[model samples]
Target: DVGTVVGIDLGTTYSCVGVFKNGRVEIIANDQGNRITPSYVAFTPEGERLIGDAAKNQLTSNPENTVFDAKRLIGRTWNDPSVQQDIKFLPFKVVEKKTKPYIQVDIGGGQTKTFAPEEISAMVLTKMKETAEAYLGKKVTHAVVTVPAYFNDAQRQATKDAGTIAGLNVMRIINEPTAAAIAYGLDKREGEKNILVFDLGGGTFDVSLLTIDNGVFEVVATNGDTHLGGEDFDQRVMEHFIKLYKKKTGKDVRKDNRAVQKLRREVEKAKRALSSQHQARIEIESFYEGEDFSETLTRAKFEELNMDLFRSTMKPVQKVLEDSDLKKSDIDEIVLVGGSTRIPKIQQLVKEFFNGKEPSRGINPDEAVAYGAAVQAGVLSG
Candidate 1:
């Protein structure tokens, strides 16, 4: 006999699987004992493939072979301007043939491997399915996967294809904002409330205004930047470091993708630390033929560096609010989603935008979407 249902949150920076068990939703942990697996993959010379931590660890050393942000490429064509710009920074080559996009990775040792976005995503999805099976101690066959609410028809269909490749039956693709609303509704059970979901994920950002009434969740309007999120913020930090290196040594280290990737890892850590501490220290070393540079980033300075990017999100937020015809005072609650929302400025901005309304704090910003997905799984299974 198979388990009735499971939920998968295939996020850009991380992926998570969960199931409703014991009258509660529980996250399924991967083999690494992690509830969320890093969304990264790398090809090895000996026909071996690495995922999760191993793949993430290889990113700095073999930047060209490791693939991250595969989520952004799904259902997108090379002709798309965003796709074209993203490909320039990506280590993998994006090749389009007759409206089909493929990623080709050089795995060293004179070998190369190619995969469609669905194939790459399936690899991660398969691991998540395995985690669910392990946690359930039974075969799991059916699930509801959550995607961005603004995902077009092609993107939604492509997500279903990823589930098919993973050998699971996808019952539905619930919108992330709706999933969050469901979770919120399940918690409060209030009759009706106007809510705003500010979801700044790893690879995407969405601002949605929704109204929930008596178990009916309606999304009034949604707006987002599909190509913007934590990855873009990390890229800005990486670029800042590179500029510092060039200023000090007069050498362009970015020409070597590997070197820049190494520095990016350190900068990403510092960025995370800024969420808690007022200042964080970071060091960039030159293991290869590049100049070394180090810097300390204060929370204020980090916000300044990313202020424009943070403000860029405001246009979509205001647009969604305007489209919904809701005033700042009308929103009873503001919910923050995604790891990027942990940034202090993001929280402050949310409060300011909503006229000093405090965003809900009961939900885990990083894991809320996945948990909400688990709730949807229970609904689908029933």
Candidate 2:
């Protein structure tokens, strides 16, 4: 039987929800008709709040109140240096509440509100829930949410709490790699094979080795970097551009928040453009103190700057392969998941490492996890 339950991919950069019906998983679009929503929020001066695109829209003008990247801080304390450094990128203030980190933004009329990381994430989850209900034409209550494969107990619980705060009955918390595997029909197919699932997302990356036989899937090994993904690649471009801008005009633009924010978008745009074009142009009128940050970014330069970070990801693959007591040659299938895997360099690297085994691109990496969760929702419904 088809299920009424929804599956959510509550991501650090983008969030998505999907429902299964008629043997297919359909991604639910928000009120704006976008399949993926930015996980950003902003508090207004009138005691009102905005989530998703509404909040993202204000990032250019009212960035001081827009909150993002909460997923990396949730379930962690400020004492962690990584959490402390992440604060510098956030527009709002982060404070300690009973040793737990929370973000505070001033509402209008001298009012302010402090929200736990879970609460901040809940707002995004609630947005997903609302979209599911509207798309399904009924009140949907249960959901299966995905978390990073390497998430700790605290991190996992924090996500579960976010769902609860959004008024959802979290039926299951599934590992990301397995969800990608299911989306590729690893569980539904009748076969015995060793599979590898490589996921490089907007804000995180992971790889896993699994075996499936007789309709059962078991994760033999997995590894990843919590702080490594597409964002790092974009950051590299931003930093390089800042240096080039300074060289071009002898103006230090990093100190200007508005300029930094503007280039942030420009660099990310270049990153996506370089995926298809040999080079991408970055041009903004008066991007920094009446100076335009203009340049032509080449794909070769991007790969050079990001090569070390790219190689760093391979260590986990080697370790996991050895730990699984099977050589790479023993694997029969390699499945690529997450949007970052779309990069040509990434595709080339995976092809070389697996000895010419072309990683399957049968499923859309952007929505694989959500689709897998929706299918599970259907099975659980029965």
Candidate 3:
């Protein structure tokens, strides 16, 4: 009872914390009364640092001071091609430091501070620590964290460094694919099972083919794009909205950081709305130079705008299967994981490819990884 080992799925879109006790894995929600926390951080003019919902809420008003999607920035240098492409859609600015790019936030008073990806991520981790402490009513330190299976050594080490900065001991680092598999496998009684774990997140898309025996889970093949995800869809909509606003007002809202940030929020809301509706309209008053921007997005139009991004997920799935010597028929099950899986097209793509069969949804995709990580914590602590 002195301390507890917890599992953390430090996801790109959102994050969660879970603890293991009495052979059970329990996910703990933060004070926000939500199981998930937005992976966002912000700094106010008064020099107060904020994380999670508070940070995301202030993004449009404090575009330069707010940082979301730090997961994409972690462990990458300015010279990294991924960062070069990713920064184009980012609202904030990236500055160079020692050959690496750190997020720069202008905090008024003619002063600005820079933060490395690891450091920014540390702030998010620090919040998770504080949340866990509050929920448990005690200080907790050790953690088992999960990262994408495709993350390189530098990325994994960067995650560890962030944990250190957050005042927690990094006990183990595991692949998110493995973490999901652990959770899926727990419900199986026996026998060898093969599955494809298709994970589409806010900032990354990856899938893993796994073979699970009575108690063992092995990753047969894993591949994905670190830069493809729901965030990409959000950017596509934002770009379209920007082009429309520019054509109407002849003022480049993109030139105004605040305008563009507000547009981003609007487009993101529209994209999510399109996921469930045939038509979604974005109407923001006085959005630019006293001009209002109003546009309606049809689901068909959204599909057209993002078909390129949509096709990107399929090629990788095919490649993984071909290289692994597994036919689509060789898999016993197809499992969908990640919040982005809520998109029907993505679900259809995975389904249509695998003989029109539905993938398993026995576990909640959002929390399964963290739940599995908690199971691993139990394993490690024992």
Ranking by TM-score: 2, 1, 3
Model 3 off-target regions past 4 Å?
20-26, 60-116, 186-189, 244-256, 291-294, 378-382
lDDT of 1 by residue, 1-382 (tens): 3356888888887988878887888887788888889888888766578887778877776767788888888878768887788888787677886576688888668687678888888888887888888888888888888888777898888889988998888887888887776666544567778889999987788898888887677788999887789878888877776787688777788677777777777788999999999998887666348445667888887887889999888889889878988878888878888889999898888888777888878767877877888898886776
The lDDT per prediction is 0.81, 0.84, 0.83
Q: Which residue segments of model 2 deviate by more than 4 Å?
A: 1-3, 60-64, 75-92
Q: How much is 273 displaced in model 1, in angstroms?
A: 1.3
Pairs with backbone N, CA or C atoms under 3 Å apart (clashes), candidate 3? none
lDDT per residue for candidate 3 within 68-111, as digits (tens), equals: 78888788888898899988978888988978779998766547
Cα lDDT of candidate 2 equals 0.84
Model 3 whole-model lDDT (C-alpha atoms): 0.83
Candidate 1 lDDT score relative to the true structure: 0.81
TM-score of 1: 0.89
Residue 235, candidate 3: Cα error in Å is 2.2
Best by TM-score: 2
TM-scores for every candidate against the unseen true structure:
0.89, 0.90, 0.84
lDDT of 3 at 6: 79
C-alpha RMSD values across all candidates: 2.8, 2.7, 3.4
Best-to-worst lDDT order: 2, 3, 1
lDDT string for model 2 (1-382, tens) is 2248898988888888988877788988899888988889888667668899888867776666788888988888777787888887676889989677899887666677889998999999999999998888888778999987767898889999998899888889987777878887778777788888888888887888888898787888888887798989999888888887778888888778788878888888888888889999988888877866668889999999899998887788888899899887988878887778888999889888988888866777888888888888878876
